[PDB]
Amino acid sequence: GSSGSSGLRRQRLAELQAKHGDPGDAAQQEAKHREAEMRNSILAQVLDQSARARLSNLALVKPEKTKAVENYLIQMARYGQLSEKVSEQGLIEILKKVSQQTEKTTTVKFNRSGPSSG
């Protein structure tokens, strides 16, 4: 749980902060953590309490399968495919959608947020 600060919506742009060298895993652990917090809110918003129970339930017997589906819903959000909160019926159908369409460990390389002395 957010220990201390939650997240301000500061409205001001500024050049990035090029930090000499690099922390590596030390910092990564943190970055990778946020990537799990944002996705959640994205899956919980695109997946109604109903669809949620359905998915998770599957993640048990088929963790790998369902997993791929999770990413699908996320990417779908950004793009603009998911109109409103998906329901059980819908989700269930999704499971048999991500499989048909090829997919693999796709990573994105870009600058999102720069570190700072703290």
Residues whose CB falls within 8 Å of the CB of residue 47, separated by 6 or more in sequence, listed in order: 55, 73, 85, 86, 91
Secondary structure letter of residue 47 according to DSSP: B
What experimental approach yielded this model?
NMR
Instruction: Give backbone dihedrals phi and psi of 81, rounded to 5 degrees, phi first.
Output: -90, -40
Residue 54 is encoded by which pair of tokens?
Answer: 């359905």
What is the Cβ-side half-sphere exposure of residue 102, based on CA atoms within 13 angstroms? 1
CB-CB neighbours of 77 under 10 Å: 15
Please list the residues that pair with 7 across neighbouring strands. none
Q: Distance of CA 102 to CAs 16, 39, 44, 105, Å? A: 36, 21, 25, 11
DSSP result, 48-91: -HHHHHHHHHHHHH-HHHHHHHHHHHHHHHHHT---S-B-HHHH
User: Any idea which fold 23-99 has?
Assistant: Helicase, Ruva Protein; domain 3 (1.10.8)
Residue 101: strand, helix, or coil: coil
Contact 73, 43 (CB under 8 A): yes
Residue entry with tokens 């959608």:
97
Of 92, 57, 94, 60, the C-alpha closest to 74 is 94
- Give the span between the Cα atoms of 37 and 29, in whole angstroms: 13
CB atoms < 10 A from the CB of 74, how many? 17
| Tokens 């919506």 belong to residue | 9
